[model samples]
Target: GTKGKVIKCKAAIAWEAGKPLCIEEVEVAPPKAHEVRIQIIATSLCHTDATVIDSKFEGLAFPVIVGHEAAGIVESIGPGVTNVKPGDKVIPLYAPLCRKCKFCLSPLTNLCGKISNLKSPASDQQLMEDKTSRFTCKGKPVYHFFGTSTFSQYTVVSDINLAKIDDDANLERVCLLGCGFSTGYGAAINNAKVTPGSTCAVFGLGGVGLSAVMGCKAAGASRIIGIDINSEKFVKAKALGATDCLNPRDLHKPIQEVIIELTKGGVDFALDCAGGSETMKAALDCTTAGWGSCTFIGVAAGSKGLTVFPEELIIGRTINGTFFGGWKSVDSIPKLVTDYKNKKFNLDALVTHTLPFDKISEAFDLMNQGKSIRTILIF
Candidate 1:
């Protein structure tokens, strides 16, 4: 198939909620204006994808390709695409950067104002800007996820949603930077702004929580306290620079109280990567009353609003939320890829297993069982 024709390829289709993806032969349409077709080489399974597949999200439509974290090479480009061309190694970014937009032009935030496809059901969250999907199986259209549907062997994404990386970059390894890794790391670096000699407490020792631990270490934190209900993750947490690891189940009092007592007052920075409202509250409460900051990187289930008492922030504690790690995806991810190549940090240890694309279900099983830190799916 050339640049203008529909290319038939294998894709893991999520036909419905709580259903295993059907690896069917699907037709991927050619990129429209300012769009690029990507040949995904390594797509890692993320919690978001799992939630959308196994649980239910209101805005998500059925028969969608549900995956957001992936790395690939540009296969083709539609008109107006310039930053990346065919043969460039790239990562698909859920958070786009149109420097012209209000949020993109601002120095205070990483969110781009052009992100209308984000949970907007009226805008047809699954479709492209022109109100359509690029994939069709049989006679029906399969919608996209986070604007970058990487579940397919080959997929199309808007030019602004793509990050061109160094030629020598390994797609499988850098794929984690697409979502979890960057989200955790960015929340620590950009949002929480973890400082040297500071004390940080990270709630949850999952892949993202471990990533927060790594970020805190990199930031030169004096003490890094890692909290998790499961003690099995403590080993990785310690290896990744956790000064102390706590299991809430082993504590006699509230986890926040334990953390506060351990830190004399409380931690300088706290992050909740677990996403439950309870964890979010704990993270905030575990911070030092004065000059303490808490960042939220977890995706809480359900459409419930967080309830915060005035006293919670009446002191000096502040709350922050991160999207795609507070990194302007299109601009920052490429630099991160380069940073990875130069050995500035380590992500290699984050991946616990690898599997072929056809064994995608196994990755989910491993994830649900809390057995895999990250499972890379090779195409």
Candidate 2:
């Protein structure tokens, strides 16, 4: 009944733009060759999911399944699937990691995908590599999200799109490593390369920004300044790794100026996860000249340009941005899981609430209302 047959299971379907999810029975078909069917155990909602729903950002097809941050088990494997097996713990990868590709082979980046993905332009961004869906609701095929339609009880993905983890991992606790934790953690370690005794400033203080603060602490930064308009997050920021917390609203002056004065010159590393154009500008301007580095972990959605004065960065400052915290999904995620097992870093603090899968809309409400740090949906 599990291997070659269709499975009828409950899934939250996002039918259109600007609507909450509808819980329903969706038919999940068997995985094709080289594909794997997985049972999602724990999925956490990220702000990016809400952005896609609210903005509809051009070219993203609707009537799709939107959850991406999750931990699961390999329920079944298709023919020729060699790595993961039934009952194996795994994390659904939003970024496909085909190690044979040129992007994966290079030490420069973690942006791995099929060569056809980089070459040809006719690909569907929401479907499997074969240009089709393994999920169908009410006889109509539904689209995927980030190659991982994880909102369902059962979902199908390519072998390359999944990473097997340790045997004893608690899926609900480490599910954040799937997206939020790893993305923020890796941004500081890999992208910013925060050195020992360096001064750092992180803006936003969400789950991703807090993870960056934790990473800075792990990398041995002397001082970590946390910036957020919401002081409710400052307590957790200090708990994670932030030494100094500031609310720009209370300061009554420009945030960059306060940070420059507080640090005596400017921070060596600055990271932004706040998704504001002004935050991006402040992140660039608050770095020290000649050797300061700024990295953007958040995204701004407006058509307006990122305004910067001509000479703001002429003194040899460096600026860059990365997705998924700059870690290769397949190769590094498992090790990150191990890092958690060894108590290298704590993911427990990031999760503030949990609810049954049917309470999906309430999870979003909590996030949108700014009352919860992270809400986990249990299956």
Candidate 3:
């Protein structure tokens, strides 16, 4: 099912770790079986993308494309690709949805293992089922990042990793739903099962944290608290439905004690979107003893593992982790697009800055400086 032709395009290439990405002419090969090629119209910079670029993971490799949050139009489809076609608007998923997998079929989990099985033995790069990269720079093969690699104008992804959406959906805005929005929103709704009149606390106030606030509000939480070290994000958090905002730095005591005191023993749900071990512990401690649940949405960097007291869990304070918001990409992404179109939540407010694709590095800088909530790169 190979297209048997190579397409030339422009792409941002990460020549090495801990360095700025460079734009260059790249060659994208035609899709193979079950693969789809997408023309990325818009992509958002995510903290996870930043983590991979900044920190050296155990299997980190260089000269690869790095990007996962993106919305685009299908340009071509390889053999056996029935889910999408050329001209279809779509979101490339980092967490793919292979319906045939046990995780996909099960109602209990959304963690599909189909894509992970395709990892290349030679490098950290994820490859096609045939074990090859569809991207190349200067005739040298470049690796794919997170299977989505939307940093380029075009990317080849497995059919299971492409979520077809409404053609009318705003590519720029719905792009946020591809990662940050869904991850946070799902953590609250799916993982925490937030109900009406429940009290919730969201830690962090970045894109994920703010989205968690939106989710808690959407789920009918009576009171939603936003926590962060930066007070500047409080306004935005309140705008998104946070009833209260707290800066941990402003308090004399541990932030968890303040939250517990404010909520009168603790909130019904606590979400840790900061990806910090301390914040995770705080999330657990700030939940109500009887029925409170803490959901972890952040991807912690480095090899450091979380350390928590066993007593934190003995009092019915449950802790869980969510991936892609517990969403089955194929079914949930399209619904999120519909929700955005229906004005169920605001995506525009989450995006603080937008720039042409050429200034991609500046977006990362803004994120590092805590100057932007989400920066969209228009292609």
Candidate 4:
């Protein structure tokens, strides 16, 4: 359904790591087979995207378009595309879903191995089935960050990565569900499987952490403890159903010990929404010894590794990692869209700032200074 022509549009390009993004005109080529071209209406700033921009991740290629949390209107579809059509409202996924894949068929996991071809370093230059980028800036080929690359006003993504939603859904706010919100909420409900009257603790009170709190609350958790270095995030966490907030700075003892002491036997569920290895270990250590579950939702940067005592896992505590909150992108994302429409939980409360796409740098600055929770960028 594509017009099969190159379109020029504005995009925030990351020409180099550790530098501000440059807003420039970029050319987006037509969609190829099993791909879709989208006009991004809105996107959000995420910490994962910021880590790449800050050069925290190793082997990150420069001159790449960065951003994965976004929503847009489909403009065209390529040959063999069937999941979505022109005029559909969609959210692009960094973790795509291909139902035919082994991983997709398994209910135990949401990760589909169909897009494994994109894992190679060479795939950045060559996207989709074609051996070339759909994006080029200043007459130079640009790399795709993740598979979404939603920083652009327009993007060409694989059809498997697109999740169509209702035409009436609020695109700007629902876009958060594409990444941070879903990850946290799903980490609690799907991954940890938090149950009624359970005690839950979420580390890091950002968008993801607060959403985790919301998830626990929805799961009927009686006591939701929020841990963060910043006391300012406590009110927001409490608003989302967190019963208790703890700032580690005020406690003389280690955070894990404090959590264990407060709960008398550690929490039933703990989530490390913070990217630090220390926090990851603390989250794991703070779980109840007999039958507690801990989920790691944060994407840690660089070569930093977590150290855990063997005894932590020896006594029946489980440590798990989740991608997209263990939700199959194609099937579950649309359901989340429906859940949002039904007022299952709060999404509007998580957004702290909304700015135009041209002020992208300011959005990043707000995130770096912790001045905003989730900054929505309107295109």
Candidate 5:
């Protein structure tokens, strides 16, 4: 279904920073002009939500409905919506790119200028970019998350924010592509551009980290190394194309030293997927001096920052933050679907577990316990 009737539906809303998502009934407005109403089938919980809940992320308005990377069926579409209509299978893009933007046209397609101010409206504040929100709680305003807000049973979003894909694709797993999967793959294949026959090291073995390992393999990196503190994740890490895996606890030396030793001198590229200042530093240290490039894809909490050995970049090493793996959603989304269709990309393996929407906290617990690589909420 691509469109639906205006109705009150259950939603898990975060009322403030550092609060649990309160599940409640919210009135979902009908799709407006150039907007879409989606019946989210499944959505994944990512580190982004953890940061927001822990007060690690700022600028996000309170009482905002979260969940960005998701897949759903279009319940309806407003006037002038031609890209997709009712009954379309779709994946939501958090950083919705207005393809007409200058940045979108430039070599760097990920830094889209469009939809940068997307946030939930303040309490009782009828002021938003559109002067209204589709989400309302007994007449109070509720904000959307990165414009996607898949936490709700249904959402009214910009039609441009969604990408239509094959209906046969598993909604449960395809949702991962909305963010984590795309980000990790972009880092390895687009940002770092890991060349074939080169050595690569990925710091951390979480969802994004494991995706980096898979990305490296897909990019034809001859040797892919996965670093993690947890020993249990190593088994899965190796299965996902980490030719070699190391436990941080096992090495008496620092992680960088171990990675350098494993790669003879250093790897051609090092990606920081752990989202820590220390891990960012380690990623740089593990790269070969004067030739290696370090890509940072994680968001670190607090005021933590990375330190660089001046010579690392002065010689030729490079470091930069990668958003969406330097991917342009409009161009990359279809390519990802094609990759999946051809059986080259393994989207199914990344989904370690699935849970019903009501047990959302349990999914977080699994992630907190380091037991789940990726958890999807079946809405």
Candidate 6:
């Protein structure tokens, strides 16, 4: 693939919050230094898209491109870019990793500075940061989401963002590792450092929740309980390593009651993949008295505060937010791909649906109906 040309791409554009994604033409600019042009093979839809579409999250410009989870082939590279070459199959991590950063070198995990540039528009194109967007049709600017707008047929991403993987892997499902999959799994395996024989409860059976269940299983957790209201997700969750499933709609039974019933007094770790105050409280309520760590992986809307008893914390229960599972995505993504190859993690099991890029709206609908665990937009 040659550089220096305007590429026309079909993308799902959100003209404003609380609106549907409109399929439209977007002009993709040539890759800049340290950048690469990728032809997205498939991109998974995430709940963050739903939150942005519903509440019009602040700081996002209008007419923004949605779909952050992505995997693709490097179509071209900018000057001085040598990490990957054309035709290399790769997964795009929303939070890129800059190895030299302080967080990356820490023994705890890799959380680097490569993400700071993500908020800069110039990283995608010549457009000014926070002023304009790289996606434009007929000379109109359309903002991008999370710097990895896989909603488009093609996108310009940092070379660091690409996690080169084996070409034989299924792009449609592997793309899920781009976001929710990585985040959820990272939370349990990395952030929580779940040990073998440990018991875990993943609150919410959405993509992240299910991925958490799989992560817990992969980490050799003795028992993994999946909590969700959708009954359809029960079987799917079990197949993904959930030892047990609990429906939240059981006569309006409280989440704490369900978790306690599953784990006696409480579980070793309670993962809040559901992002609500109620969910957080429930996670706290279901945590073991001592050495129980409650990790929050969900992004709650607004200022929803958690109300937990003081005794919960006094007993050594800890709570912390997990940004992409507190691991540098660059280091974690490749390992995750390897894990998938080794059958340690179930990437294919998490992908419940796949659709053409033109049917992006239908993908969102399926998510709303709770009929899909993870929906991929196949290019």
Count of residue pairs whose backbone atoms collide, per candidate: 0, 0, 0, 0, 10, 1
Clashes by residue pair, model 1: none
lDDT of 5: 0.80
Among all windows of 10 consecutive residues in model 2, the one with the lowest summed lDDT is 115-124
Q: Over the stretch 197-229, how does candidate 6's per-residue lDDT look in tens digits?
A: 999999888888988898898799999888886
Q: Write the per-residue lDDT of candidate 4 for residues 165-198, one digit (tens) a residue.
A: 9889899899998899999999898998999999
Model 3 alpha-carbon drift over 4 Å, by segment = 1-4, 115-125
**Taking the tens digit of each residue's C-alpha lDDT, what string does model 2 give over 1-379?**
5889999998888788678889989999899998999999999998877766565344457788888899999999998999999999999987778888788998989887562444211123478768888889998998887778888999998999889999999999888998888988889999999999999999988889989999999999999999998899999999998999998899778999999999988999999988777888889888998799999888644435377665777886888876788888888889999999999998999999999999999999998888887899999
**Which stretches in model 4 have alpha-carbon errors above 4 Å?**
117-126
Clash-forming residue pairs, model 6:
110-328
At residue 310, what lDDT does model 4 achieve? Answer: 82
**How does each model score on TM-score?**
0.96, 0.95, 0.95, 0.95, 0.93, 0.91
Residues 1-379, model 5: lDDT tens digits:
2244666888888888877788889988888888888889999988877776567666666677888878999888888888987889898876666778788779855766664443321122222247677888857888777778889989877877888898787788878888888888888988999999999998888878888888999899999999888888888889989989887778679988988887878999999888777888888888997688899887655646776667668978888767767777866787787778888778888888988998888877888888887898987
TM-score of 2: 0.95
- Candidate 3 lDDT tens digits, 1-379: 3246788888999887778889999999999889999999999998887777664544656788988899999989999988898899999988877778788989998878664633321133367778899988986988898788999998999988889999788898999988999999988889889999999999999999999999999999999999998899999999999999999899689999999899889999999999767888888889999888989877555636478778877888788878889998889899989988989988898999999999999999999899999999998
lDDT of each: 0.87, 0.86, 0.87, 0.87, 0.80, 0.78
lDDT over C-alpha atoms for residue 202 of model 4:
97
| Per-residue lDDT value at 241 in model 3 | 98
Candidate 1 TM-score, C-alpha based: 0.96
Which candidate model has the greater TM-score, 4 or 5? Answer: 4
